[PDB]
Design a protein around this ligand. Structure first.
Ligand code: FAD
Ligand code: FMN
Ligand code: CL
Length: 419
């Protein structure tokens, strides 16, 4: 009987510990389960996942191999596939998330054959004994990527079952699949890496790799990416790998501090008097704040499903600090709009930008939204693409008074954080 390789957020054949572990023991059949716990989300994100499952199937077929795709609860469908295939055992990459642990425990209960979970490739794993709140001490544990595992060359024949629905994303998707991902990585490392340190804070995000949507679904291994960048080397190289490490730091943080999905990491801010306000929330959410940078950022996000780091930190902080909007609502709304939307990473970014205790970033740093545009969109080209409404970064009729908002936040904040 075959071994089942169950792909979850790891829609690739390269650097895939579970796939090779299984192949070394016998013939394999792969499986994806379309799980409503993950797929009951926005069309853009469902489609991005589905189209990558479709690409993974194409990759299996091109190698002569068989990828099943079933729809439903994993603890019903994984056992179903095991029974139908007469599988000897199921292999998958460990998941340390509360849902991943819940689901995998339930699957192990329902399976009458072993479930073998292998460590997912990381630069640093999320479940180290020690709990860092600060990126620098965490980052020093990393000493360069281990080598990635090869993809299989050809795959053993097996039966294929199951359909992959076609859904409307509502917008243009990147090219799905690991072949497009690896091409994009190779091009970034050639063209852009040298100036990455100098260009990564552009509001247009064009100094970066734009590989997040692949990372978020495991279509590209972070180990492979760090490994390739380190073989390329140069100055941008250390700095770009540092950013891959912020991804791992985000998993580390949600792992050691799970409660941060409920409340600020900094207990000093847990009683901050946020102001619910529907009209205000909608103005932010729809990019109608009258603040050029924020409005351009939120309008690109709706239209495209992507935003540069520098745009994200400005859009997110603005809601929290200038508008005082409850962070949980905004956080979630923001994730639902992102192709690369990744709960742990988005939470990290929000708690960092909002000054809620990640990396002990200080409350007093408040983005001046006009300086930020002047400094990170030099000739206004990015503003002109995304809200040509506005002839400069000067607020035209802002939903709040901006200097008062700044004064009010800092007052409030410098007043919880002391005492
Ligand atoms: C409020 C906020 C919310 C965010 N939400 C998400 C999210 O849901 N999903 C997501 O993938 N990223 C999120 N980011 C992190 C980061 O902005 C994006 O990963 C980045 O813009 C991706 O662009 P890139 O692929 O060109 O990155 P590059 O600059 O080329 O970096 C390479 C890779 O490193 C990782 N990375 C880069 N910056 C960060 C960072 N600040 N934190 C963690 N990992 C990083 C990503 O995997 C990225 O693709 C968020 C950031 C903020 C400030
Ligand atoms: C938009 C999106 C859709 C996803 N859909 C699935 C899916 O249907 N099946 C699955 O096994 N993994 C899916 N994943 C990867 C999972 O999130 C993965 O199961 C992970 O190991 C545990 O889920 P979690 O992120 O909620 O903790 C999806 C990821 C994202 C970002
Ligand atoms: Cl085991």
């Amino acid at each position: 009987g075959p071994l089942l390789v169950w792909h979850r957020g790891d829609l690739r054949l390269h650097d895939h510990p579970a796939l090779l572990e299984a192949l070394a023991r016998g013939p394999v059949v792969g499986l994806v389960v379309l799980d409503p716990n993950n797929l009951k989300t926005t069309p853009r994100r469902r489609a991005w996942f589905l189209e990558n499952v479709r690409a993974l199937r194409e990759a299996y077929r091109a190698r002569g191999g068989a990828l099943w795709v079933l729809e439903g609860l994993p603890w019903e469908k994984v056992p179903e596939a095991a029974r139908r295939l007469k599988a000897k055992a199921v292999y998958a990459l460990t998941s340390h998330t509360p849902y991943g642990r819940y689901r995998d425990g339930r699957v192990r209960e329902a399976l009458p054959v072993p479930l073998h979970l292998l460590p997912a490739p990381h630069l640093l794993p999320p479940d180290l004994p020690r709990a860092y709140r600060v990126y620098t001490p965490f980052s020093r544990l990393y000493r360069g990527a281990a080598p990635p595992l090869p993809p299989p060359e050809a795959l053993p024949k097996g039966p294929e079952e199951g359909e992959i629905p076609r859904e409307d994303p509502g917008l243009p998707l990147p090219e799905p699949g690991e072949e497009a991902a690896l091409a994009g990585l190779r091009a970034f490392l050639e063209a852009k890496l040298p100036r990455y340190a100098e260009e990564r804070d552009r509001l247009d995000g064009e100094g970066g790799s734009r590989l997040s949507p692949y990372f978020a679904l495991g279509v590209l291994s972070p180990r492979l990416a760090a490994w390739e960048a380190e073989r390329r080397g140069g100055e941008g190289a250390r700095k770009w790998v540092a950013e891959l490490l912020w991804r791992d730091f985000s998993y580390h943080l949600l792992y050691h501090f799970p409660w941060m999905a409920e409340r600020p990491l900094d207990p000093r801010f847990q009683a901050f008097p946020w102001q619910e306000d529907e009209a205000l929330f909608q103005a932010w959410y729809e990019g109608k704040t009258g603040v050029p940078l924020v409005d351009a950022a939120m309008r690109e996000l709706h239209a495209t499903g992507f935003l540069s780091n520098r745009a994200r930190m400005n859009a997110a902080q603005f809601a929290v600090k200038h508008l005082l909007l409850p962070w949980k609502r905004c956080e979630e709304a923001f994730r639902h709009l992102l192709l690369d939307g990744d709960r742990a990473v988005n939470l990290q970014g929000w708690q960092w930008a909002g000054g809620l205790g990640v990396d002990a970033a200080p409350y007093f740093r408040v983005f001046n939204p006009v300086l930020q545009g002047e400094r990170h969109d030099p000739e206004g080209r990015w503003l002109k693409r995304w809200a040509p409404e506005y002839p400069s970064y000067a607020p035209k009729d802002p939903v709040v008074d901006l200097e008062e908002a700044r004064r009010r936040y800092l007052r409030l904040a410098r007043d919880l954080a002391r005492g």
